[PDB]
Design a protein around this nucleic acid. Structure first.
Ligand SMILES: [Mg+2]
Ligand SMILES: [Mg+2]
Ligand SMILES: [Mg+2]
Lengths: 175, 129, 52, 187, 51, 112
RNA sequence: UAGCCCUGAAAAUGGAUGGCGCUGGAGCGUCGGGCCCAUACCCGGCCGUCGCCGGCGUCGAGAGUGGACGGGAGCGGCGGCCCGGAGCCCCGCGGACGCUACGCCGCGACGAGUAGGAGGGCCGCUGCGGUGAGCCUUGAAGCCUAGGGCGCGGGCCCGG
RNA sequence: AGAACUGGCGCUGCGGGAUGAACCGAACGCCGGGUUAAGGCGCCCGAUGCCGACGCUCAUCAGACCCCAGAAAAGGUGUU
């Protein structure tokens, strides 16, 4: 997967074909993060084939709908569990973010795994994402925003070069 | 403004540059007449960029405008009065030339017979006295 | 078999009057069926962690 | 680019004869008029046989012609052949059939016209039957030549029957090894 | 080749029903527009007659 | 699937192709099918004597789909004016070459 | 434990992320929306080739995807005193181009090329048989030419 | 040095790889408008002169894009 743009949470269910041996298969369900629902119903068969004896020929999906959050305005803390690949071996990883939505924090993970650990999006498997409540966070960068009456200024502001004239007689103050 | 033929279209020509032979600037034992290059390693036959172009049938001119003179006529060189009279029923589409061997005595008479017959001659005032 | 039970099933459509279409077709795309999750709710599965 | 084809797009038939015979050139103008205008398939076979070569228009004898007109149904038709009519010496009497050919030979049009038949060209064929109605267009035996018995697999392959190019027939001329099992082998 | 979907009356040479499919979707989106312009008025009208 | 991009077209995608880029073959010639005659004069043996009846067999795939599809010359489409993405990997993998199942409609409108 | 960075890390003309340079990036990773241009793709022109044709109806009188006469019976319609019957053009004597059939026209698809193979040449050189009631001391051939042109080209014509 | 399968080069120009037989796109009649592929968009050099997003990194030998043109084991209370 390329994880192009912001990601998007999907609920995908599906079940294997009803054989003459087995009628009514159990119809499993997953939680896929993908940029569109064609990739999402492809990522469903990547994980289901790793856990059950199902594949796209001998199964189908019976729902692929975008599930999205019941509070896009509340600020939430997300702790997520990872299974990325490194150059030497593969690792388990816990990781905490802070965003207004589930899909925007997992997008913030793939940007961060590429930034810190150089881990490409085909090599990292999200295990579970859930919103966690404060005083159960363990990452002190997320923890330092838990402050009622939090305050800081903006130091040393820079933007808008060449738009405001390339050639001016005016040394631009950085506040 | 002499005899003003029938409908003259806008002559496109696809090229006005007279294809020259390769390595003909460099020698004078090589005339400018086109020969196509048949060498195994040269760059004009193998058609690299920025080099001497080579003719093909794609440069050919429009069939309704081929052999048109810049005045709008199509020449037909004559030698006497009698084959100037063969150009009577085509005088608004074709024109006559007097050949270079016709003497100034006989060229004087066949340049007046063409004016009666309303034929444009392309060299009317050649070899005057 | 499907020249024997095809010639005779051709002449069953002449006594009964129909258009059985005895030529075989490949596997068609699947019909719009209807699945049922009666009683329960679907199973949430998730990828296992890595341990050697 | 569109494909990777190894071109056979130029079909290789004849759209005109290679002859400069100005009397065959007027038959072509007559029949390719009648080909594209009368809406019949007789006149298209006769038009394409006039384009053919001297080899592809083999001669037709008199006793293939009257043998293919003793048949049931042919009792009043005309035998059109694009090619010459010769006569067998083998045949003894001739019926009063009506023929139509390029170039009947002189003894052939004497024995036809003794019996009371009629000889035609392709000009008065069109005036008689423009559609070609009631015609048996006959052909000559085009693999009857001396050249086709030299054509085949190879004269020295198994069973082969292929007649080698020897310069003279006889003993001591290509008869020794490869042709009998004693001297060497036999194909 | 003049283009269908770009000029009329070439479509109507290929499809006569294209015209009556087209004024039916111009008659109704004029009356769905006259409804919604009047309804958006009809809220703030008496909301102003309140004030 | 390395060489093709494909998917399932909706009603106005098949509508836009037959009108704007639709051409027909009769014998060997690629004609503009700008008449309801030329569809009936050849493919009228199958009851699909007009343009929009040719569009009905090829969207709601019917009995004479094969003969109606072979009648159409393959759509010589224009270059995609939005650009593409990577052209050499799969549509799932980030590129475009493969099945995309309703997103081919967004590409046809760029192609056509 | 693994990302970047560093140590390990030494070659002879002066030197190479291509250079200049680059550190709120002009570096690395993960993405976005714009934007740039191939002889590729789409639309149009023109050239050739190939495929399938058309037109001998120059038929301003030709008209025919069905056709006539003349008799046994019925109308709608043309002129009534409800009985009814072919008119061959003419007040205009008229009406473009064409089709070297080896020609002309139409439509569609195509066009890399060594070795090699075919075709076309109204490309060119020398000589012959015919032919232009050809050309010329009122200036031929040849040569020269910031002259004018034609042909995709081979080449050619004209002016001086 | 020698095989297998397929594609190429040789016989082949063009766009990109600074450069180039073989890499990546794409194959070529002569042009006009449109669009793209691979590849890019400080300035050479057409195009980010976007108020682009998020981090990682300081080197007294930084790093910088398929083939492809330079490095390993080991090690660092250097930072993440
Ligand atoms: Mg070479
Ligand atoms: Mg050669
Ligand atoms: Mg590849």
């Amino acid at each position: 997967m390329k994880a192009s743009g912001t990601l998007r949470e999907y609920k995908v269910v599906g079940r294997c074909l009803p054989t003459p041996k087995c009628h009514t298969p159990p119809l499993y369900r997953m939680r896929i993060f993908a940029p569109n629902h064609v990739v999402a119903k492809s990522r469903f068969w990547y994980f289901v084939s790793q856990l059950k004896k199902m594949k796209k020929s001998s199964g189908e999906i019976v729902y692929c709908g975008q599930v999205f959050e019941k509070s896009p305005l509340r600020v939430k803390n997300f702790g997520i569990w990872l299974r990325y690949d490194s150059r030497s071996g593969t690792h388990n990883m816990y990781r905490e973010y802070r965003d207004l939505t589930t899909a925007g924090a997992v997008t913030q993970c793939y940007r961060d795994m590429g930034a810190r650990h150089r881990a490409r999006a085909h090599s990292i498997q999200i295990m579970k994402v859930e919103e966690i409540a404060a005083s159960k966070c363990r990452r002190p960068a997320v923890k330092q925003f838990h402050d009622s009456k939090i305050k800081f200024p903006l130091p040393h502001r820079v933007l808008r070069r060449q738009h405001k004239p390339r050639f001016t007689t005016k040394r631009p103050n950085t506040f | 403004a002499a005899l003003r033929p029938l409908v003259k279209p806008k002559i496109v020509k696809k090229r006005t540059k007279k294809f020259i032979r390769h390595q003909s600037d460099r020698y004078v034992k090589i005339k400018r007449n086109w020969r196509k290059p048949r060498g195994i390693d040269n760059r004009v036959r193998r058609r690299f960029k920025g080099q001497i172009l080579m003719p093909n049938i794609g440069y050919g001119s429009n069939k309704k405008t081929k052999h048109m003179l810049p005045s709008g006529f199509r020449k037909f060189l004559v030698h006497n009065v009698k084959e100037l009279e063969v150009l009577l029923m085509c005088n608004k589409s074709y024109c006559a030339e007097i050949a270079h061997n016709v003497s100034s005595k006989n060229r004087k008479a066949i340049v007046e017979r063409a004016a009666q017959l309303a034929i444009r001659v392309t060299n009317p005032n050649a070899r005057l006295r | 078999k499907r020249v024997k039970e095809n010639d005779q099933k051709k002449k069953e459509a002449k006594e009964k009057g129909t258009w059985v279409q005895l030529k075989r077709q490949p596997a068609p795309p699947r019909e719009a069926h209807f699945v049922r999750t009666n009683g329960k709710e679907p199973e949430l599965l998730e990828p296992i962690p890595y341990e050697f | 680019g569109v494909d990777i084809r190894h071109n056979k797009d130029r079909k290789v038939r004849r759209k005109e004869p290679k002859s400069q015979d100005i009397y065959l050139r007027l038959l072509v103008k007559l029949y390719r008029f009648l080909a594209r205008r009368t809406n019949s398939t007789f006149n298209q076979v006769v038009l394409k046989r006039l384009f053919m070569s001297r080899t592809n228009r083999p001669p037709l004898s008199l006793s293939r012609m009257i043998r293919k007109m003793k048949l049931p149904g042919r009792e009043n038709k005309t035998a059109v052949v694009v090619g010459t009519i010769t006569d067998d010496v083998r045949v003894q009497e001739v019926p009063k059939l009506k023929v139509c050919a390029l170039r009947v030979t002189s003894r052939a049009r004497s024995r036809i016209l003794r019996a009371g038949g009629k000889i035609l060209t392709f000009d008065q064929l069109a005036l008689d039957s423009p559609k070609g109605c009631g015609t048996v267009l006959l052909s000559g035996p085009r693999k009857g030549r001396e050249v086709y018995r030299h054509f085949g697999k190879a004269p020295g392959t198994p069973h082969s029957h292929t007649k080698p190019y020897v310069r003279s027939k006889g003993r001591k001329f290509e008869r020794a090894r490869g042709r009998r099992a004693s001297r060497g082998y036999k194909n | 080749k003049k283009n269908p979907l770009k000029n009329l009356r070439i479509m109507l040479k290929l499809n006569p029903y294209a015209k009556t499919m087209r004024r039916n979707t111009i008659l109704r989106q004029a009356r769905n527009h006259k409804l919604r312009v009047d309804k958006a008025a009809a809220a703030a009208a008496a909301l102003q007659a309140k004030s | 699937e390395p060489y093709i991009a494909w998917g399932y077209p909706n009603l106005k995608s098949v509508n836009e192709l037959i009108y704007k880029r639709g051409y027909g073959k009769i014998n060997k010639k690629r004609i503009a099918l700008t008449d309801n005659a030329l569809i009936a004069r050849s493919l009228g043996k199958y009851g699909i004597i007009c343009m929009e009846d040719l569009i009905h067999e090829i969207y709601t795939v019917g009995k004479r789909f094969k003969e109606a599809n072979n009648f159409l010359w393959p759509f010589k489409l224009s270059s995609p004016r939005g650009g593409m993405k990577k052209k050499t990997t799969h549509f799932v993998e980030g590129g475009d070459a493969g099945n995309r199942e309703d997103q081919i409609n967004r590409l046809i409108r760029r192609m056509n």
